[PDB]
Amino acid sequence: QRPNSTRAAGAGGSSNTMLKLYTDESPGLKVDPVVVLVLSLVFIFSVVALHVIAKITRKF
Amino acid sequence: KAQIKQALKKLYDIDTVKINTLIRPDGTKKAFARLTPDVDALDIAATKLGLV
Amino acid sequence: SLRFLDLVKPFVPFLPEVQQPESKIPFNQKLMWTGLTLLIFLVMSQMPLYGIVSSDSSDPLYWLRMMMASNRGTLMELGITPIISSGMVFQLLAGTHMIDVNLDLKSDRELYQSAQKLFALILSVGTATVYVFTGLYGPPSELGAGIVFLLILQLVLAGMIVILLDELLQKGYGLGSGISLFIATNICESIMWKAFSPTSINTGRGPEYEGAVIALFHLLMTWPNKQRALQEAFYRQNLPNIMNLLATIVVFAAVIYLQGFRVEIPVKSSRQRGARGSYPVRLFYTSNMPIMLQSTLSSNIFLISQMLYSRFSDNLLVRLFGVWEAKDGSSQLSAVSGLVYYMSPPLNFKEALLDPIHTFVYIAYMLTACAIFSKTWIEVSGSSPRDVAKQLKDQGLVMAGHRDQSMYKELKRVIPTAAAFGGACIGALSVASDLMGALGSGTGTLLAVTIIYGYFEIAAKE
Amino acid sequence: NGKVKAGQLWSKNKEELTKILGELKTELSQLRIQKISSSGAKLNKIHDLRKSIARVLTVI
Amino acid sequence: DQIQELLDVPREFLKDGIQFINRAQKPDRREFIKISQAVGVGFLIMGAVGYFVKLIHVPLNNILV
Amino acid sequence: EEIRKIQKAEEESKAEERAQEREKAKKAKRDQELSQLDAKAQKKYLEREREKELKRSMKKATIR
Amino acid sequence: DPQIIFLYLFLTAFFSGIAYWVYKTWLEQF
Ligand SMILES: [Mg+2]
């Protein structure tokens, strides 16, 4: 007597052709998508800098 | 009924044991043709009539 | 197993989450966000890792990284295995009622979603620890305790970024899902890199190019013997070639043709005279979903097999369950005997011809597991004939000359058969494609085609 | 198959025409039977089949 | 009984599947071309973005490392 | 016409800001009332939302 | 050689089909 999925319950989500995890908003640390993009760019820059700095040290 | 039986035999190689008929309120005739027991109406409909 | 109601409850405030869009995002912005996520995913997939002492150790997921959107030695080494693993596990458990979940409650749905994301995080961290301790980039003894934690940090935060990007795509800012998007991206990029790579390696002749089309150009343009040039370009072993190009093209055409299949249930609007239409039931009713589920299950099984073999290969249970050997000419381990070997795919057509029993067992496993996965998936998701009848009734669609119960009977006739036999057919197509050997995996080409079709169907709507 | 031009019917003997007619009749008759249970835009080919039958009968 | 039931169950499965295949309408030669065009253009644009980006990345990759 | 164009853009900016505020308030109200309903109450509420949305979409589609 | 035979058959079919198609499209006009 309970729904098998969120789609069965009427909350959307995963379908027969696509698997989806996210259907609602949880009381977690809410963040903005622009902030997510900025954090990804920060990740890229930081990992690049990790190579560059040690490259300079190995040159020294 | 005789014409319906002969037409079914000629058009689909269908042999019937009896045919009942009525005239619908829309003016067209509806025929229930019972096939012989050795022939399966499901296969006949699937292969010749396009019914599933 | 079921908790009281859930165990994640204390963890919920600690988990970051992207905000749902306060308004309907226009399709232009949907495309914009999808393309941006594309670019960041590509950058992370190509940007190499740290601490790499050497990139020649055995990789337990050699044949599955390109299939699951992972590249060795880069930030995308994690791929999306934690994503699909946590997904599949939670969705199957909730749909078969192993866990005490009540998806009618929005709070319960939030807890369920948080548990899915959280479990994905644990899966990422665990497989990262397994990777670093098995030393895919040099053994930990040569690495040192100061750099292994650094590596763990990069892998964890990369998986975290991937989780947030997938959540961003799924919650309406983009199109489809990050899983399918990244899988298709990786497959397409790898395939036309194999087709058009300008890099060159020193073979017995000298510097020769990687891309098949570039080799086709260069061999004809530098060899007066056109027949010899074509003989090399078409059948050169250990390098991509025009025979693989033909395999890719033909498998692309075949999968598109088979995807075009669907049974047309004649339906009608109940509030308007005439207006006859059709509800389509695709032969690939679950599309690539059974293949993805099987691939995730096989990746987990392969990882556990390889990681058990490194510590307990002496025991008889581990070798009966699966045997890995480092075949000559490479340090990469491969399955030789055991259940994992039988569930692993054959290398090629000629190699498959060398073991009829193993190929038969693998083919049976593929067909059966894919059919079972599709049949369970349609009932886990809202796509059973009951749900389809409910949706049709909600839309106000009926069959002319029939009652809603006859509609449901026809849906019971079609939908389960569609799911099971389409899973079997997609398994057979996967087997044939991998046998025939495209540039990338033939199953990879199948996945790319199906995901492109799905995104096209999404795009079509808007 | 499809439309039958009247130009290509005047050279055939009555028998040839009656044969064509037969095929057309069957095709047309079947077209209906098939249409009812199937989404066939060819539910317009019935006009062409009926006109072809009329043409063959006229020539005969 | 245990030897032909083992064949009959997949035999019935094959019957059902072949019935579905027979009943399903096959894409005509006009649907095929346009669907192939759409899938091809999507594959081309995605693979092209990836190829261009990895091609501009790899020289920087080897320069960095 | 020029003066009307100026005040038009003024009004669009103000209306856009207040419409964003009202949309946020609507979402907050939906979350606040939907959170504390029963299981069947939540199910019925979601079904009513879907049915009303479909009804309005069909009313828009039926326009000649 | 089976591979040489396959290559020759593919080349014949492929190039003859392209030639015929290009003929019927453009060269048929001349
Ligand atoms: Mg009477």
Distance CA C253, CA E33 (A): 10
The residue in chain E having the minimum alpha-carbon distance to the alpha carbon of residue C260 is E27
Distance CA C263, CA C279 (A): 8
The alpha carbon of B17 and the centre of ligand 1 are apart by a number of angstroms equal to 17
C133 and C140 Cβ atoms separated by less than 8 Å: yes
- Helix (H) or strand (E) holding B21, with range, is strand B16-23
The residue in chain E having the minimum alpha-carbon distance to the alpha carbon of residue A52 is E64
The alpha carbon of B20 and the centre of ligand 1 are apart by a number of angstroms equal to 7
Token digits for D31? 């077209």
Distance CA E50, CA E42 (A): 12
* Burial category of C292 from C-beta neighbours within 10 Å (exposed 0-12, middle 13-18, buried 19 and up): buried
State the first-to-last Cα distance of chain C, in angstroms, to the nearest integer. Answer: 41
The residue in chain C having the minimum alpha-carbon distance to the alpha carbon of residue E34 is C256
Contacts of C348 (CB under 8 A, 6+ apart): C435, C437
> C204-224 burial string, b = 16+ CB within 10 Å, else e?
eeeebbbbbbbbbebbeeeee
User: What three-state secondary structure class fits B30?
Assistant: strand
State the first-to-last Cα distance of chain D, in angstroms, to the nearest integer. Answer: 21
The residue in chain A having the minimum alpha-carbon distance to the alpha carbon of residue C108 is A26
* Burial category of C201 from C-beta neighbours within 10 Å (exposed 0-12, middle 13-18, buried 19 and up): exposed
Distance CA A6, CA C94 (A): 10
The alpha carbon of B23 and the centre of ligand 1 are apart by a number of angstroms equal to 8
How does strand A29-31 pair with strand C16-18?
parallel
> B7-22 burial string, b = 16+ CB within 10 Å, else e?
ebeeeeebebeeeeee
Return the amino acid letter for C309.
Y
C138 and C56 Cβ atoms separated by less than 8 Å: no
- Helix (H) or strand (E) holding C266, with range, is strand C262-269
Contacts of C114 (CB under 8 A, 6+ apart): A26, A28, C8, C11, C12, C15
DSSP state of C238: T
* Rg, chain D, Cα only: 12
Token digits for C57? 């150790």
> Nearest 5°: phi and psi at C136?
-75, -10
Distances (CA, A) of C92 to A19, C185, D9, D28: 11, 27, 67, 51
Q: In what order do the strands lie in the sheet with C397-398?
A: C276-282, C262-269, C397-398
Report the interhelical angle of C106-134 vs C145-168 (nearest 10°). 150
| Tokens 């079709």 belong to residue | C453
Return the amino acid letter for D39.
S
Residue D35 to chain C, least CA–CA distance (Å): 11
Token digits for E32? 């095929």
The alpha carbon of B28 and the centre of ligand 1 are apart by a number of angstroms equal to 13
| Tokens 């979402």 belong to residue | F27
Give the residue among C410, C425, C282 at the shortest CA–CA distance from E24: C282
Distance CA C176, CA C455 (A): 7
Distance CA C266, CA B52 (A): 12
The alpha carbon of B48 and the centre of ligand 1 are apart by a number of angstroms equal to 27
Using a CB-CB cut-off of 8 Å, the residues of chain C touching G11 are 230
Counting every residue written for chain F, the total comes to 64
Pseudo-torsion of CA C301, C307, C310, C312, nearest 10°?
-70
E touches G, CB cut-off 8 Å, minimum 3 pairs = no
* Rg, chain E, Cα only: 24
Experimental method: cryo-EM
Contact call for C104 and F34, based on CB within 8 A: no
G20: left (phi over 0), alpha (psi -120 to 50) or beta: alpha
Distance CA C370, CA C285 (A): 12
Of C18, C84, C285, the CB nearest to A33: C18
Using a CB-CB cut-off of 8 Å, the residues of chain C touching E49 are 38-39, 42
Report the interhelical angle of A33-59 vs C145-168 (nearest 10°). 150
HSE-up of residue E14 (Cα within 13 Å, Cβ side) = 6
C435 and C346 Cβ atoms separated by less than 8 Å: yes
Give the residue among C254, C214, C249, C212 at the shortest CA–CA distance from C234: C212
Using a CB-CB cut-off of 8 Å, the residues of chain E touching C263 are 20, 23-25
HSE-up of residue G21 (Cα within 13 Å, Cβ side) = 6
User: What three-state secondary structure class fits C105?
Assistant: coil
- What residues of C are in the F interface, CB distance below 8 Å? 22-23, 102, 104-107, 394-396
Token digits for C77? 């080494």
Distances (CA, A) of C64 to A15, C27, C169, C270, C341: 24, 33, 24, 49, 15
Give the residue among C334, C354, C362, C336 at the shortest CA–CA distance from C432: C362
How does strand C333-337 pair with strand C323-326?
antiparallel
Beta bridge partners of C207: C202
For CA atoms C8, C11, C17, C23, the dihedral sign is positive
Using a CB-CB cut-off of 8 Å, the residues of chain C touching F54 are 394-395
- Alpha helices, DSSP H, located in C47-171: 81-96, 106-134, 140-143, 145-168
User: What three-state secondary structure class fits C192?
Assistant: helix
Of C46, C47, C261, the CB nearest to E24: C261
- What residues of A are in the F interface, CB distance below 8 Å? 9-11, 25
Return the amino acid letter for E52.
F
Residue of C100, C106, C270, C387 to mutate for F, most F C-beta atoms under 10 A: C106
